[PDB]
Nucleic acid binder design. Structure first.
Ligand SMILES: [Mg+2]
Ligand SMILES: [Mg+2]
Ligand SMILES: [Mg+2]
Ligand SMILES: [Mg+2]
Lengths: 241, 149, 120, 57
RNA sequence: GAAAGGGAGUCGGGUUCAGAUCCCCGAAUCCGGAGUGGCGGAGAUGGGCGCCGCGAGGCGUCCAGUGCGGUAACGCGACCG
RNA sequence: CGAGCCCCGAGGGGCUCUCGCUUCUGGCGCCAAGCGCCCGGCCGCGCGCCGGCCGGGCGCGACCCGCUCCGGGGACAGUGC
């Protein structure tokens, strides 16, 4: 009612040859740096090529819920840090000075880390559970671990991210962690996790061994093939009946 | 200098930013200054327009033909020369054309070309008549002219 | 919903560059100025042409260091003779020295300045 | 004058009191004014023509 | 990457045994700088209404004011960006 | 907008070119109008979506999703022996 009559809409149409185009999103059309292009093309290649099952098994990671319970359990057994190791050593020195003496005092169960340590534990059948990161970039350190764990009878699961295992062990990255013996109040939770993981991984290793990965074409190629198939199907439908 | 075909300085508008884009088309014969030329798939058949061969009829002739779908013009560029669009097939998106040498070439239907013949006419009709005229001709081109047997 | 690439070119992002904060100077002390005013002014010229310049153009003729420029010559003369100069002309002699014709301010007399210097 | 002499000339000496003055000639300025007005009028005419032509389904 | 290409702006007179478009005298000129703004001029300083005032002219209020002329070619000392 | 493709009840979905704004002129065209949603300050109805004034931000305008920039070759060419 009080609107200024001088105000008006001034729409610009962006047809071809008309008013110049607006600054729109061009992320799909950016000349990207060579390293970005290389990593994206590697990701695409891992879907183009036929990935052997020994490498494709690591695409089967734990679901988010199960990974959450597993990491929640594993947080109770994180290795002791440098500061609290210093505190424990000072406490031991003070206690030995006065007056108990040796006092091993039940060295607590801890989460074992490192691919070599985990491999030795699996070979000795000491590990109760094995957790393997899915994204070990030099992927030869852990390719044998599913098979070795299956043969030795220890349950193994694959989890998303070596960074999470590294945060478990106060480092940047850990390939694998191992659950050895556990406290009594957590034995039941470990048993539940072991049952679920044995169902998901060890009991179907026979077809994990045969599930090849990759061999998927691009969306443009799939759309073109589907267009050809629909083109012949629309006339075959009229041919039939 | 060095070519017999006149060049056409043609100014377009940049579709994405406020700027003027100047091109250096090969002048098809008949075009003049102050003339509007149109380049694209929906351009009409007129002398000087640039449009894909697949959208052109079965007997049209063209000036600055692309050898590959996307480079600039490569064929029939020398003065007086032209190519002819012989045939099409909508499937496989191919067009058969006749080159100035008389050879037949199958190219993509997306190759663009200028409608008409390139200007510069029958330049080879006039006898050179003079070693000096030949000298001036090749001085603008390269060091090839005085040819010892 | 706001991060957009309106250009098809990836440019290198601008990252801050710290200024140098060295933990020790590479040289313990700054080297002193070898081209002080005594080094700039070597000795005055006392030839017939120089005396003619002194008594006619109000100009003192000096032989100066080859690396000294007109500003440095002007400041050197101003400091170590306590006189004001109008301008400085400079040439390099065929023997490699540098010769400066220093024209004094009108209120200063080149003749008695030359007397107190000792080049009469 | 030579191009660097134009830096020390006053503004008036380098242009003419008119739109495009000192850059375009009067004749072609008049031609551009008429061309702009007439082409915009033609746009109005074709807009009205299609608006009255769309009256029939 | 040019002492022959492009490239702002120094001329007249005198002067030495030997230097001068370089020195001296006299006339200019180009480029750069002025933060505390160097001086002027321009922008820019007019109309309307109430009043006072013999008239002229003053007071209050409101509204303008990024220059002007010529039909035009174009002009005038500036003439926001 | 469209021929209206076909059901048509004249609605309208499956079905085709369009899933388009630029051809009589030697003009001009960018740095968003508009709409919607919020965040401040101001005086202030002084009953809250609430009176109005000075600023700021986001979205639609400018559809969504996607795995190779787009196109042309291609297990040939090419390279090594
Ligand atoms: Mg011969
Ligand atoms: Mg010199
Ligand atoms: Mg150079
Ligand atoms: Mg001489």
């Amino acid at each position: 009612k009080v609107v200024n009559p001088l105000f008006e809409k001034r729409p610009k149409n962006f047809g071809i040859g008309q008013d110049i185009q607006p600054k729109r999103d061009l992320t799909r059309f950016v000349k990207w740096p060579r390293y970005i292009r290389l990593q994206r093309q590697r990701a695409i290649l891992y879907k183009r090529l036929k990935v052997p099952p020994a490498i494709n098994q690591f695409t089967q990671a734990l679901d988010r819920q199960t990974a959450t319970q597993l990491l929640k359990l594993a947080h109770k057994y994180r290795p002791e840090t440098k500061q609290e190791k210093k505190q424990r050593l000072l406490a031991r020195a003070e206690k030995k000075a006065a007056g108990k003496g040796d006092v091993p005092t039940k060295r607590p169960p801890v989460l074992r880390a490192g691919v070599n340590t985990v491999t030795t534990l699996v070979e000795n059948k000491k590990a109760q559970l094995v957790v393997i990161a899915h994204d070990v970039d030099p992927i030869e350190l852990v390719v044998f671990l599913p098979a070795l764990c299956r043969k030795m009878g220890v349950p193994y699961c694959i989890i998303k991210g070596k960074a999470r295992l590294g945060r478990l062990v106060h480092r940047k990255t850990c390939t694998t962690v191992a659950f050895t013996q556990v406290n009594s109040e957590d034995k039941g939770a470990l048993a539940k996790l072991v049952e679920a993981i044995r169902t998901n991984y060890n009991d179907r290793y026979d077809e994990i061994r045969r599930h090849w990965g990759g061999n998927v074409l691009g969306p443009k190629s799939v759309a073109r093939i589907a267009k050809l198939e629909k083109a012949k199907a629309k006339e075959l439908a009229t041919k039939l009946g | 200098p060095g070519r017999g075909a006149p060049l056409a300085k043609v100014v377009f508008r940049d579709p994405y930013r406020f700027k003027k884009r100047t091109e250096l088309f090969i002048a098809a014969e008949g075009i003049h200054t102050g003339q509007f030329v149109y380049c694209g798939k929906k351009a009409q058949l007129n002398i000087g327009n640039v449009l894909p061969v697949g959208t052109m009829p079965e007997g049209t002739i063209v000036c600055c033909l692309e050898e590959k779908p996307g480079d600039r013009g490569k064929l029939a560029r020398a003065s007086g020369n032209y190519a002819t669009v012989i045939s099409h097939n909508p499937e496989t998106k191919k067009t058969r054309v006749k080159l100035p040498s008389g050879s037949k070439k199958v190219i993509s239907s997306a190759n663009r070309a200028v409608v008409g013949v390139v200007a510069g006419g029958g330049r080879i009709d006039k006898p050179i008549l003079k070693a000096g005229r030949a000298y001036h001709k090749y001085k603008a081109k390269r060091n090839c002219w005085p040819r010892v047997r | 919903k706001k991060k957009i690439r309106t250009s098809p070119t990836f440019r290198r992002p601008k990252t801050l560059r710290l200024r140098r904060q060295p933990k020790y100077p590479r040289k313990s002390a700054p080297r002193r100025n070898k081209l002080d005013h005594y080094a700039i002014i070597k000795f005055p010229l006392t030839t017939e042409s120089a005396m003619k310049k002194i008594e006619d153009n109000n100009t003192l003729v000096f032989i100066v260091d080859v690396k000294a420029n007109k500003h440095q010559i002007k400041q050197a003369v101003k400091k170590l003779y306590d006189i004001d100069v109008a301008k400085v002309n400079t040439l390099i002699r065929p023997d490699g020295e540098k010769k400066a014709y220093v024209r004094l301010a009108p209120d200063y007399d080149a003749l008695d300045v030359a007397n107190k210097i000792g080049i009469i | 004058v030579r191009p660097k002499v134009l830096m020390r000339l006053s503004k008036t000496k380098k242009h003419v009191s008119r739109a495009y003055g000192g850059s375009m000639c009067a004749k072609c300025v008049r031609d551009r004014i008429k061309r702009a007005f007439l082409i915009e009028e033609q746009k109005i005419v074709v807009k009205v023509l299609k608006a009255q032509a769309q009256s029939q389904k």
